[PDB]
Design a protein around this ligand. Sequence first.
Ligand SMILES: *[C@@H]1O[C@H](CO)[C@@H](O[C@@H]2O[C@H](CO)[C@@H](O[C@@H]3O[C@H](CO[C@H]4O[C@H](CO)[C@@H](O)[C@H](O[C@H]5O[C@H](CO)[C@@H](O)[C@H](O)[C@@H]5O)[C@@H]4O)[C@@H](O)[C@H](O[C@H]4O[C@H](CO)[C@@H](O)[C@H](O)[C@@H]4O[C@H]4O[C@H](CO)[C@@H](O)[C@H](O)[C@@H]4O)[C@@H]3O)[C@H](O)[C@H]2NC(C)=O)[C@H](O)[C@H]1NC(C)=O
Ligand code: PIO
Ligand code: NAG
Lengths: 117, 324, 345, 337, 106, 327, 330
Amino acid sequence: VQLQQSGAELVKPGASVKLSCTASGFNIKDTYMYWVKQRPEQGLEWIGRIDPANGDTKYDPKFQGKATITTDTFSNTAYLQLSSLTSEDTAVYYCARKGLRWAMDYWGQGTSVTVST
Amino acid sequence: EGDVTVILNNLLEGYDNKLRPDIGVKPTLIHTDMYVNSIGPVNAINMEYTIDIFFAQTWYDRRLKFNSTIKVLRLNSNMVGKIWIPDTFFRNSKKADAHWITTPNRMLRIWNDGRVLYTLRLTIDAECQLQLHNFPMDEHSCPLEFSSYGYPREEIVYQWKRSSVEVGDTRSWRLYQFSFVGLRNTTEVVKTTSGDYVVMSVYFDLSRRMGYFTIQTYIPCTLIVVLSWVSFWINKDAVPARTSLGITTVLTMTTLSTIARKSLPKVSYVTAMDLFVSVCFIFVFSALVEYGTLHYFVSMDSYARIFFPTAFCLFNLVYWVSYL
Amino acid sequence: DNTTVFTRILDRLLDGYDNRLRPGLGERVTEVKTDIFVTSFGPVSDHDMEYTIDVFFRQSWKDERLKFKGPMTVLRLNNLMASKIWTPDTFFHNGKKSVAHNMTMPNKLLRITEDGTLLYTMRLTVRAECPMHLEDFPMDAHACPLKFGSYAYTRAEVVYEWTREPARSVVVAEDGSRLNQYDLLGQTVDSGIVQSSTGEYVVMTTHFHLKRKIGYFVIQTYLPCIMTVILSQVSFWLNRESVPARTVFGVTTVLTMTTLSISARNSLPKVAYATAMDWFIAVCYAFVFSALIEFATVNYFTKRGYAWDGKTFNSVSKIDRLSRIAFPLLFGIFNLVYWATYLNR
Amino acid sequence: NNITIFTRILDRLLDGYDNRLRPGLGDSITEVFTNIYVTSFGPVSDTDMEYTIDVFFRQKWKDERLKFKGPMNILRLNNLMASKIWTPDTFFHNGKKSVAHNMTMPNKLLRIQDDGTLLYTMRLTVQAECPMHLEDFPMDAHSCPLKFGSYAYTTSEVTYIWTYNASDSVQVAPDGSRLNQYDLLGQSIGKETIKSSTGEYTVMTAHFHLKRKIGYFVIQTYLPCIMTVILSQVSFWLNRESVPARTVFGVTTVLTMTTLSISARNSLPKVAYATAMDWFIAVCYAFVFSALIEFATVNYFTKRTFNSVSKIDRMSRIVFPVLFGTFNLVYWATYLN
Amino acid sequence: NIVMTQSPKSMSMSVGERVTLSCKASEYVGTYVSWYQQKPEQSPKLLIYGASNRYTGVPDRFTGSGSATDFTLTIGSVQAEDLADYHCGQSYSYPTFGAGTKLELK
Amino acid sequence: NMSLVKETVDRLLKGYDIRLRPDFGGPPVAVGMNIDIASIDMVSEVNMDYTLTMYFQQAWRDKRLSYNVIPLNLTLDNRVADQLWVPDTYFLNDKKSFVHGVTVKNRMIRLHPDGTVLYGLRITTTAACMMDLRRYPLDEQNCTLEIESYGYTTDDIEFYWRGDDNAVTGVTKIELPQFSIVDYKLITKKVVFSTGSYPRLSLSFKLKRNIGYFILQTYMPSILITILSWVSFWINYDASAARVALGITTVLTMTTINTHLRETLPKIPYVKAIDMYLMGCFVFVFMALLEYALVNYIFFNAIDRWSRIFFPVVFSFFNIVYWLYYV
Amino acid sequence: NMSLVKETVDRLLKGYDIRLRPDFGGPPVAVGMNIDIASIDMVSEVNMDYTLTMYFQQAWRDKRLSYNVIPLNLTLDNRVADQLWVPDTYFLNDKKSFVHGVTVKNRMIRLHPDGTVLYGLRITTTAACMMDLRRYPLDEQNCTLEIESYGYTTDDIEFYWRGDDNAVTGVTKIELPQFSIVDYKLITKKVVFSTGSYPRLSLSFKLKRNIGYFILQTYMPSILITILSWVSFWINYDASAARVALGITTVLTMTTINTHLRETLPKIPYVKAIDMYLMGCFVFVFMALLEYALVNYIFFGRVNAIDRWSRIFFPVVFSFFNIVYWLYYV
Ligand SMILES: *[C@@H]1O[C@H](CO)[C@@H](O[C@@H]2O[C@H](CO)[C@@H](O[C@@H]3O[C@H](CO[C@H]4O[C@H](CO)[C@@H](O)[C@H](O[C@H]5O[C@H](CO)[C@@H](O)[C@H](O)[C@@H]5O)[C@@H]4O)[C@@H](O)[C@H](O[C@H]4O[C@H](CO)[C@@H](O)[C@H](O)[C@@H]4O[C@H]4O[C@H](CO)[C@@H](O)[C@H](O)[C@@H]4O)[C@@H]3O)[C@H](O)[C@H]2NC(C)=O)[C@H](O)[C@H]1NC(C)=O
Ligand SMILES: CCCCCCCC(=O)OC[C@H](COP(=O)(O)O[C@@H]1[C@H](O)[C@H](O)[C@@H](OP(=O)(O)O)[C@H](OP(=O)(O)O)[C@H]1O)OC(=O)CCCCCCC
Ligand SMILES: *[C@@H]1O[C@H](CO)[C@@H](O)[C@H](O)[C@H]1NC(C)=O
C-alpha cells in the first residue's frame, strides 16, 4: 500500500552509501523488489531485482559489481549498498514492487543522492 | 470461507443422489447446450468422425436451494459425484471419454434459486453413415444424437437453447478434405423396448473438396491415358516399341486402380471415381486393340489419333457436368 | 514418538479444511503461479496435426489455511496429501489425450512452506494439437502452441502468472530433443483473456517455434525426381532409329515419376491445396513428359527405318540437337529459381 | 427369513478374519491345487514370438478359518466375497500382457465348501512368450510354454500340485481351435523349482506342442519361386538371334526373384540366421541368374548362310531342368522328414 | 538485452483532442509492456498493466494497443491534469525502459 | 411425495445382502435376456472376429426389492448397481469389451413394484468368430455370440430369450457394405463343464459376403489379363520381342495380383476359392506363353490358328465350371 | 501361531502415518535397488524406444515396522502396499508402463524383523531411447533407463545399487532377434533441477546390431543388381532395345529398393550408412547406362574399346568401392 524511503544524503566521491526502502501494508516474501535508476531529464534504468523467499538476486549487466542488496524480513525493509560510487552517479533512486502483470504498481517517494563538495 | 461451508454442508445433508428432482411430481426439464471446439478427421474407411465439445446442461433442483447473500456457488469437479447428474449418453458414439488432466474437466455452478449448470469436456467418435455414391464429390449430414438412458419421457424432458450450438474458429478445425457448411438442431421422441425417450440431434453438414483426389487420382490417370494416345504417332513397323507402350499403360492403370481403392473402404457399389477409372481403362484397352487390328490389316491410324482424345474430351464434359 | 509431532501438525491442517472452496473465496483473487520444465519435446506427428511434450508442470499458490509452526519450515509431503487439499483445475485448451504418469507411485509432489505458500509439480505427457499450414512443405516453419488455463474458475476468481520472468519461465532441457524431423528454435510465452458463454477466463499460451529439416526429403523425393529427369534427358543422345530403345526411356521415366507423385503425399494429410513439393513434382512431370513428346515429334519425321552402318541413312535431327542443350538448360534455370525462392524465405 | 440364516454364516466367517495372512502362516505349507481348462487356443503371432490362450484357471486350496455348520453343503458365492478372503498371488512367468475379463461382472468363481475347501476359477486371456528357433522355417515345431507360480511366497510357504492325474490336468476344448497357421499336437506338463533372487519358487509349467502347416507358404512363396524358375528356362528354347526377347526373359525373372526375396521375409522377424525358406530362394536365385549369364555367352559366340543352334543351349535344356529337379528332391526330403 | 524506443521525444498540443504515443521493442515482447507517467518532482504511477488493460483509478480516456513488437498509448481527450512524461517499459525479460516522451500545454 | 420415496428406497437397501442371490438355497431365478443390435462395426477376417454394439437388457425378480405404496416404476440412478445383486452374465467368445462411460456409466436400473429388477447395459463387444474361408469370397459365414452365466449353475440361475425372437431386434437393420445379415437364431442350451452344468443362450447371425466389390477389384482385373495374353496369339511369329514382352507381362501381372491379395487375409493353409481362380487363370496365361515357345521351336501358322479358337472355348468353359460350383 | 501374527501386524499398522517418510525431519533413508531384467521385447527404431520387462525391487529400512516376537520373515499380501509408505520412484524416460494385474497385481512385500521391507514389482516399461543412426545398420546403440525419486530431494532419500554390479541380473540370457547385448553399466549420480537435488540411478545397455538380416535382405540384392548392369557390356552395340531395357531395370530396381527400405525407418535428416551404399551402387548402375549412351553417340554421329575397358574398369572400381566401404563402417 504505502512505500517509504529515507531522506536525501550528501556523500563524497569514492565513499559508500546506505539507502533503505520500507514497505508497509504487505510482506516482502511474496513479491519481488524492483529498484531503478532515474537520472535527471532522462528515462528510467533498472539496476536489479530481489526474490526474498530464497534470497535470489540478479543485477543489470552494466551495474554488475556496483550495487548490493540485503533484505531483512523482520524489519520489513530492504537496503541499498553502493560501494564504488563516483561523482557521475547523481540521480534519484526509486523503489518498486512486482504488480499484477509484472508491472511496477506501487512506487516509493524516491530518494535523490548528491555527490558533490 | 466459513459461510460457504455451512451452506454446502446444509445442502448435502438429507440429500439422495439416486433420486432425480421431482421424482413423483413432474418431469425434469434439462436445457442442454454445446460448444464445439474442433471437429476432427472424418474417417471414411471406418465411418466415424471425431468431435471435441464443451457439453453443458442446466436443470432445476429444489433441494439445492439456499438463502444467503452469495448468489452463485462456483465449485470444482469434486461436487459432481455428490449431487444428481442426468445420465446423458450419445447413442451414435463408438467410443468417447472425458478429459482428466490435471483435474477432471467438469464445472458445477449452483444458484440460490436451485438452478444447476454442469459443463464437461468430451471427445466423441460419432457414427456418421457416409454414403459413398458420388465419391469424391460427397455431401453428408453427420448427426450427433444424445438422450437419457434410464429416464423415459415421463421423467426427463431435454430441450435446446436459442443461443445453443456454438461453432468457434471453424478455421483451425482438422477437416482437411471437407468443409463445414452448416448446422441444424432437431428434437424427437424415439420408442424403444423400455419406454419413450427424448432424442436431441445436431446435424453437421459437410461437403467434400476435390483437393488431394484430383491431383493424385484424376490428373495422374488422365496423363496416363494421354500417354496411351502417343502410340498412334509411332510408326506401325516398330512392333515391339508400340506393344511395350501398350502393356505398361494398362498395368499401371490396373495399379492406379488398386492404389486409389486403398483410400476407399470395402464397399460394394461403384463410385464416380471408380467410374472414371473404368472408363479410362476401357479407352486404353480399346487403344491396344486399335493398334492390334491395324497390325494385321497391314500383315486409318490418324482417325484414331484424334478419335480417342475427342471421345475422352466429350466424356469429361459428360462426367464433370453430371456430377457437379 | 518423534514422528507424532508431525502427525499432529498434518492432522490439524486438515481439521476443518474444506477442499471444495478456493482459498480467499470471499476476500481476494487466487494467484496461481506456474512454470514449465520441458524434460523432452517429443515427436511431432504431422499426419495427425499434433505433437507430444513431456513437462514438469509446476504450480504455486498461497493458502492461508495451511499455516503451521513446527520444527522444519517446508513440508516435503507425500502425494496423497494433495488430493485432501484444494488444487487448481488447470486444463490444456488444445490438448487431445494427455497422461499423468503413475509409475510406480503417482508422479506428483507437494511442498507446504510454513507461511502457507504451496508448490505442486506434476509430471505429464501432453499430446497437444498444433494447427499447421503445410503450404511451404517441406521448407516450412511452425509455431505449435500450448494453451492452458482454469476450467471452472473465471478471471475474477483464479488468475495465472509465471513464477520467474516470462523469458525464463518455460525451460527446455538439453538432453531432451526427441524431434527427429523438426528442429526446435526457441519458445515464447504470452498471457491473455478468452471469452466464453460462462464467463471470462485467463489463458496462458506458450508457443514452440519449430523449423523442419529438409534432409530427409532431399534423399527421398528431390534427388529421385532430379535423377529421373536426367534419366529422361539421356534419350536425346541416342539415334533416331532406335524406337524400341527410346520409348523405354520415354515410358519408364514418367511411370517412375508418377509413382513418386503418389508416394510423396502418402505421409502428408489430405491437404486440400498443393504444397511446394507438389509444385516441384508437377514441373518434373512436365520435363519427363516433354521428353516423350519430343521423341514423338522426331519419330514422325524419321523417313527411313534402318540405321547408319558406315544406301542413304537418316541424318541426325535438329530437334535432338536442340533438345540436348535446351532441356538441361531450362531444368537448370528452374532448379536455380525454385530453391532460391524457397530456401531464403 | 431363510436368507438371513446364510447372512449370519458369512458375517461369522469374516469376523476376526485377516486377508493379509495366508492359511497356516506359522504352522505348515499351503497346498494349492491347480487346473487349466483351455476354451480356445488363439493365434500364434509369429512376428512378436508370442501366442494367446484363453483359460479357465481353477485354483483350489484349504483354509481352516472358512468352516461352517449350516443347512448347506457348499456356498456358491459371487466375486465380491473373493476380495475379502485370502487368494494366492499366482502370476504367469512368461506372460506379456494378460487381462481378466469383467463383462458384465468379474469372471470369478467362489465355492467355499463345508470342510474349508475353496475353489477359485477365473477367465483369462494370457498372452505368453514362446521362444522360437526359425532355422527350419517354415517346417518349425515349437512347444510354446506357459509357466506360472507364486510371486511373493516361496516353496516354504505356498506349493502347487495338479489336481487330477498329470496327463489329463490341462484339458483343451475341441471346438476352440483358433490356430490358423499351426495345429495343436498335444500338451505336456511339469513341475520344477526355480531359485530366484528372493528364494526358491515352485513353478508350474505346461508346454503346447505345435507344428506349422506348410500349405500357406506353398501358394505364396514356394510355387511363385518355382514357377519363375521354369519361366526363366523357357529362354533356352528360343532363337539365338532374338536378342531383345531373351533379355526380357533373363531380366524380369531375376527382377521378380528380388521382389519375391523381399516379400517372402515380410512378416518374418529379423533373426540373424538364414531360414530354410531363405536357403531355398538363394538356390532358386542361382538357377534364374545363371540363365541370364549363359545368354551373355551365347550372344558372345554368335557371329551373324545363317547362324546355328548353340550346343551350349541344347545342353542347357537338359542339365538345367534336372539340376533343379534333383535339388527339389533333396530339399523337400531333408528339411521335410 | 531489450531496448524500447519511444517516438517522438516531445510534442505540443492543447486541451481536448487526440494523441498517439509510440513504443517499439527490439525483439518479441508478448503483452508485458507497462506505461508509467512521471509528474515533475513526484513519484511514478501505473497507467496500463499489460497491453490494453486499464489500471484501477486512472480515467477511461487512457487506452493501449498491443502486438508482438509495436505498442501505442492513446488518449482520447488531453486534459489539464496530464502534465507528465510517459515512459514505456517491458517485462517479458529483465525490465528495461524507454527514454520517455515529454509534453506541454499552450 | 418425494420424501416418501427416500424412506422406501432406504428401507430396500437396509439389510440387503449383495453376496447372496435371490431365493438362495431354494429355486433358481429366471433371468430374461433382451439384446437390441444397434450396430455391427467391423467383421474383420484377419483377426477373425466381429465388433458388436448392443443394448443388453436383463429382467429377473427379487422379493427383497418390493415396495407397495408407490405404484410408479421406480427408476434409480446407475450407481445403485454397486449395492444390488446383478447376474454374472459373461460372453464366452469375448475378446475385448467395454461399457461406455460418457457422460456417466451407461446403465439403467428400474425397480418395479412387484420386485422386477430391470438391468440394462450398452455394451460394445468384439466376439470371436471363426471363419471357414474355403469358398472366399462367395462364402457364407455364421457368427455367434454366446451368453452364459459364470458362477451360478442351472439350479441357481436360468437364462431365456424374454419375448422369444423379439428378445433380439435390430439385427437385420444393420448396414454391412461387405457382408449381409441373412438370419439370426436365438438358441437356449445348458453347457456342462467340469464344475457343473450352466445355462447358455446363443445369438447367432448368418452373414453372406457380397462379391460385388471382389468382382470389380479381383475377378475382372484378372479375366482381362488373360485377354491381353490372347493378343499375343494373333501377333506374327517373327515379332519375337513383341510377343515375349507381352507374354512376360501377363505372367508377372497375375503373379503380383496374387501376392497383392493374400496379405489382407489370415495365413490360412487351405486354398480359398479366389485362389483356385487365380491359379486357374495362371495356367491359361502360362500356356499362352508356352504356346509361343512351341511356335518358335517349330520355325527356327496352323498351330498359331488353332490356339486362337481353342483358348476362347476352354476359358469360357472354365468360367461355366467355376460359376456353377461356387454359386 | 496364528493370532500372534495377527495382533502383531495390527499393532504395526495402528498409528502408522503413510504421509510421512521414515526418519522424517532426520537423516535420509537408503533405498537399495534390485532390478532383474526379464525380457527386452521390441527395440523399435521407428518410435525410438525399447520395451523392457523387469522385476524392479526397492529395499529400505523403516524403524516403525520392527516386529520382534515372531522369528520369521513375514511375507504379507500384495494389498498391504496401500497402507505402508513406499518411495515415489519414477522412470524419467518412461513412455508407457504398467504393472501386470493377472491374477492379482504383481507385487511383493516382505517385512524383515529388523524393519527392512522387501518390495519387488513386475514392471513392463517402454523406455525412450534416442538413437544415432548415422552408421545404420552397422551401429551399436546405448539405451538407458533413469530410475529417479520424484518428490524427495537428496536430503530425504538416497539411492544405491544393492550388491554393486550384482544389482542387475538376467541380462546375459536376454536374446534379441536383431540386436545383441555387449555391455551394461550401473551409474549412481545426482541431478539438480530448479526444485532441488534428487537421487538418480541409471541402468544402461550397449546394443550391437546383427548384420545377418540386412546382409542377405538388403546388401546381397544390392551387390547384384549392379552385376546385371555389367552384363550390358557383353551385349553388342547394335542391340539398342536389349541394352536399354537391361539398363533401365537395374536403375529402377535400385530406386524402388531405396524407397522400400526407408518407410520402416523414421524421417531422419542425415544419411544412414545403408543409404550411402545404396546410393553408391546407384552411381555404378547409372554410369553403366551412361556408358552405353556414350557408345551409341560415338557410333551414330560422332567403339568396342570403351566396352572392353568398362568390362575391366567396372569390376576394379566397384570391388575397390567395397574395400573402402567395408573397412570404414565395419
Ligand atoms: C472392468 O475393469 C476395468 C479395469 O480394467 C474397469 O475400468 C475402471 O473403472 C473404474 C470405475 O469407473 C475407473 O475408476 C474411476 O476412474 C475415474 C477417472 O479415471 C480415468 O483415468 C484413466 C487413466 O488411465 C483413464 O484411462 C480412464 O478412461 C478410460 O476408462 C473409462 C471408463 O471405463 C472410459 O470411459 C474411457 O473411454 C477410457 O477407456 C478413466 O476414465 C476417476 O475419476 C474415478 O474416481 C472415483 O473413485 C471412486 C469411485 O467410486 C470414488 O471415490 C469417486 O466417485 C471418484 O470420483 C470422484 O472424484 C473425482 C475427482 O477425482 C470427480 O471428478 C468425480 O466426479 C467424483 O467426485 C474412478 O477412480 C477406472 O479408471 C477404470 N479403469 C480403466 C482402465 O478403464 C471397469 O469399470 C470394470 N467393469 C466392470 C466392473 O463392469
Ligand atoms: C517439344 C518440341 C516440339 C516441336 C514441334 C515442331 C517441330 C517441327 O517443326 O519439326 C520440323 C523440323 C524437323 O526437323 P528434323 O531435323 O527433325 O527433320 C528433318 C526435316 O524433316 C527435313 O525437312 C528433312 O529433309 P528433307 O527436306 O526431307 O530432304 C530431314 O531429312 P534428312 O535431312 O535426314 O534427309 C529431316 O531429318 O524441325 C525444324 O525445322 C526445327 C523446329 C524447331 C522448333 C523448336 C525446338 C526447340
Ligand atoms: C434449435 O436451435 C434454435 C437456435 O439455433 C432455437 O431457437 C430452437 O428453439 C432450437 N430448437 C429446439 C429443438 O429447441
